[PDB]
Amino acid sequence: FVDGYRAEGSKENAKGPWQTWNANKMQSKQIAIHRAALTYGYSYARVLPGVALDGANQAEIHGVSPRRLLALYEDQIN
Amino acid sequence: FVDGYRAEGSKENAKGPWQTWNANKMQSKQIAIHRAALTYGYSYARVLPGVALDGANQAEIHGVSPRRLLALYEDQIN
Residues in Cβ contact with A15 at an 8 Å cutoff, skipping those fewer than 6 apart: none
Task: Compute the distance between CA of residue A57 and CA of residue A67 in angstroms, rounded to an integer.
Answer: 30
In order of B11, B38, B52, B75, the CA distances from B65 in angstroms are: 34, 12, 25, 21
Residue A65, burial from CB neighbour count under 10 angstroms (0-12, 13-18, 19+): middle
Q: Is B76 an interface residue toward A (CB < 8 Å)? A: no
A59/B55 Cα distance (integer angstroms) = 41
Query: Closest Cα of chain B to A71: distance in Å?
Result: 20
Determine the distance in angstroms separating the CA of B49 from the nearest CA of chain A, rounded to an integer: 23
HSE-CB of B19 using CA atoms within 13 angstroms: 9
Task: Establish how many alpha carbons lie within 13 A of residue A44's alpha carbon, considering only the half-sphere containing its beta carbon.
Answer: 10
Resolution (A): 3.8
Q: Cα(B52)–Cα(B59) distance, rounded to whole angstroms?
A: 8
User: How is chain A classified by DSSP, letter by letter?
Assistant: -------TT-SS--SSHHHHHHHTTHHHHHHHHHHHHHHHS--EEEEE--B-TTSSB--EEEEE-GGG-----SSS--
The residue type of B58 is: Q
Residues of A in contact with B78 (CB under 8 A): 29, 62-63
Q: How many residues in total does chain B contain?
A: 78
List the beta strands (DSSP E) in chain B: 44-48, 60-64
Cα B6 from Cα A14, distance rounded (Å): 21
Assess A62–B contact: CB distance below 8 Å, yes or no: yes
Q: Compute the distance between CA of residue A71 and CA of residue A75 in angstroms, rounded to an integer.
A: 12
Q: How far is CA B31 from CA B4, B19, B20, in A?
A: 16, 19, 17
3-state secondary structure of B44: strand
CA A69 – CA A41 distance, rounded (Å): 13
